[PDB]
Amino acid sequence: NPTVFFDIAVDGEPLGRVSFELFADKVPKTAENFRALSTGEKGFGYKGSCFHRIIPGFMCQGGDFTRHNGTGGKSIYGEKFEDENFILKHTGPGILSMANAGPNTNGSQFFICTAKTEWLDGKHVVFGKVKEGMNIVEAMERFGSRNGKTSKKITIADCGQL
Amino acid sequence: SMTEYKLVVVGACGVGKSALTIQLIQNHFVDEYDPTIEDSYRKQVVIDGETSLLDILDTAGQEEYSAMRDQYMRTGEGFLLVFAINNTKSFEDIHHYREQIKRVKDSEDVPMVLVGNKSDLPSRTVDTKQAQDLARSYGIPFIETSAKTRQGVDDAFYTLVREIRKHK
Ligand SMILES: Nc1nc2c(ncn2[C@@H]2O[C@H](COP(=O)(O)OP(=O)(O)NP(=O)(O)O)[C@@H](O)[C@H]2O)c(=O)[nH]1
Numbered sequence: 001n002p003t004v005f006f007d008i009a010v011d012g013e014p015l016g017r018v019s020f021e022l023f024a025d026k027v028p029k030t031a032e033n034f035r036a037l038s039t040g041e042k043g044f045g046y047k048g049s050c051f052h053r054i055i056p057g058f059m060c061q062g063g064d065f066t067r068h069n070g071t072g073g074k075s076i077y078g079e080k081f082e083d084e085n086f087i088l089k090h091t092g093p094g095i096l097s098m099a100n101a102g103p104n105t106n107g108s109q110f111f112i113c114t115a116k117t118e119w120l121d122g123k124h125v126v127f128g129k130v131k132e133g134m135n136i137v138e139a140m141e142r143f144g145s146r147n148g149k150t151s152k153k154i155t156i157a158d159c160g161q162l
Numbered sequence: 163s164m165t166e167y168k169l170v171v172v173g174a175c176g177v178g179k180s181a182l183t184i185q186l187i188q189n190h191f192v193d194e195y196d197p198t199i200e201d202s203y204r205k206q207v208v209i210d211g212e213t214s215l216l217d218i219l220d221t222a223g224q225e226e227y228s229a230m231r232d233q234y235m236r237t238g239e240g241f242l243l244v245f246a247i248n249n250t251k252s253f254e255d256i257h258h259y260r261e262q263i264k265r266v267k268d269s270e271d272v273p274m275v276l277v278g279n280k281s282d283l284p285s286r287t288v289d290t291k292q293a294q295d296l297a298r299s300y301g302i303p304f305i306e307t308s309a310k311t312r313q314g315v316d317d318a319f320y321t322l323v324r325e326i327r328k329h330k
Pocket residue numbers: 173174175176177178179180181182192193194195196197198199221222223224279280281282283307308309310311
């Protein structure tokens with residue numbers, strides 16, 4: 001299983017590094033999309049994009065690098081790809097899963113759980129989990145709010161594969 | 163000497179719930195779609211010579227999270243049922259929002275107004291007559307609106323206040 005990192009920034013100031021194990025063993029197409037978006041090797045990806053929706057007690061959501069407004073994003077396969085499987089579940093804080101607009105609409109947006117979110121099981125594809133830096137994810141919550149709007153700009157200042 | 167009303171705006175995704183509310187509250191429109199999680203607004207108005215505080219809950223156009231949405235409907239005094247005139251599914255969705263409000267409030271007589279939004283656009287798929295017929299069948303007003311041009315915006319919210327004042 002590959003490992004990728006995000007260097008998170010708050011109004012451009014480094015906050016810390018989060019690293020993720022990606023479950024290529026169980027979810028290869030979805031894991032490969034996130035890995036490639038993180039290295040930027042296709043010429044586009046997560047570097048510079050923001051966590052646009054942070055809701056304390058629930059999740060941190062990001063990944064819109066095409067419209068920069070929470071509505072966009074794109075996969076390495078096309079604008080959207082199918083839900084690969086629902087083998088893995090949203091079992092607690094640190095789960096990494098795909099955001100979507102309904103069945104078979106995976107692009108680039110993703111979320112990191114800060115809680116067990118079992119009602120999302122079978123509707124969002126889980127494909128990784130936080131390895132190191134869960135404390136950075138917990139710190140990102142201070143900047144969120146009930147409607148997910150952030151009080152400072154939370155960005156992926158750097159990202160890549162370890 | 164004042165009154166206060168809890169108004170809730172409901173309807174399918176992208177019909178203009180937020181754009182209508184922001185026009186009422188902030189007197190502007192932007193084309194950019196920012197999907198709602200939940201927003202609340204408060205404004206003092208004068209309607210028919212009577213001053214009121216409007217507390218407006220702008221809901222997301224999703225019907226998941228029934229516990230939360232049920233609470234929205236229990237607390238709300240009156241509801242705008244919004245569809246877009248260029249989205250047939252959003253109009254076909256209207257009866258479900260009405261049924262949910264009746265079931266949660268356990269009542270056949272809840273203040274509501276049917277709002278056909280995006281009336282400025284040249285891509286109509288829902289005929290005005292169909293909407294008027296549905297509102298008549300429900301015994302509620304129908305208002306045509308455009309958040310972009312401000313057509314009918316005050317009218318929609320004020321008519322809902324009149325429906326609450328009448329219901330009481
Ligand atoms: N031309 C036109 N566009 C409109 C009108 N009302 C809303 N829109 C556009 O429709 C899109 C969605 O509007 P919005 O108010 O966000 O919809 P919503 O019903 O609040 N969506 P959600 O359920 O996700 O919260 C935006 O691009 C907005 O500019 C209108 O009267 N005319």
